[PDB]
Design a protein around this nucleic acid. Sequence first.
RNA 1: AUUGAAAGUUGUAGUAUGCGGUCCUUGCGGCU
Length: 319
Amino acid sequence: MIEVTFTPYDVLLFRESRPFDAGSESVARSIIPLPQTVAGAIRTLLFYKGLKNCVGVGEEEPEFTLVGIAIGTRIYPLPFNIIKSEKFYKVVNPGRFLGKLILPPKGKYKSGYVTESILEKYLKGELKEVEENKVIRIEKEKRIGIKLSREKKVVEEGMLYTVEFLRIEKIYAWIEDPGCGIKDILSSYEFLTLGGESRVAFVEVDDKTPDIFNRELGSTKKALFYFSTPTIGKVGEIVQELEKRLNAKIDDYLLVSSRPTAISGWDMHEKKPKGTKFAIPPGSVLFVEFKEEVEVPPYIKLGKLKKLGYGLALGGIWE
RNA sequence: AUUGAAAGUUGUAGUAUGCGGUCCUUGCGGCU
Ligand SMILES: [Mg+2]
């Protein structure tokens, strides 16, 4: 597995799906980067390097597989079963009622990010709570710009716009290369355009598997699956897929989640927006009670568009 | 082949208008 590290020179824009044309709708608000955007940046580099075989021009997916992405300062969205109570974010474990897994009422969820070490303790079921100071928020930087007339140096009519950028220190991407020679091509490049407004990020590439993908969790009936990237597909099909890949049937499951992630994007091949897809948002947790004990995998890919970085679930246990 | 491409928060704008360092005060006492 190859590990790509993107270091933004300054700011990044991963624009939400909304009109953003000069002289009209003029507000661009960034979201947390979707893995397909990172995949697109890599595919575009290969598209220009002449490796159009691995790109998948006009195709939904490339030949290579983007395992997933993570932002860094490496941090992850607070699991949705972690609820803020006073100055602490408390882990809420599944309960049972009428023979069904439920999450007991303990307050509303508040968004935020935690370090990889805090997530690791969570996945091992050893995390009780997190002090509110260790819960990170992503910094935004709002910039307001204009367009000037060529000669008179005054603002052209209606040419004012606003961008809410993200201030991100690092983005990590992991790629499985079936022999396209991506590691060599990425090594030849120092930087690439990532997201909107022609912002660039420095590129480093190392041949390594992150330790979080190599954890030994043991065997249990009570496994959980933390989605680190958006996961596309019906919950039923995802659970069924999970049953097949682990060769074990499920007694019951509970999806703790939030607002669905709206995913469209821009088709650079056809020069028009991509079709809207809906996904289980990062930070969502699928609690599963298998009928038999399973060896909980450190990570597992689920749902549609796996090669674009979607459906990266991190294994964990609960009691 | 990335909700992507493209867009100078710029142009005009005097820290200025009014305002007394003035009022009260014996170079004197006779001492060292
Ligand atoms: Mg632009």
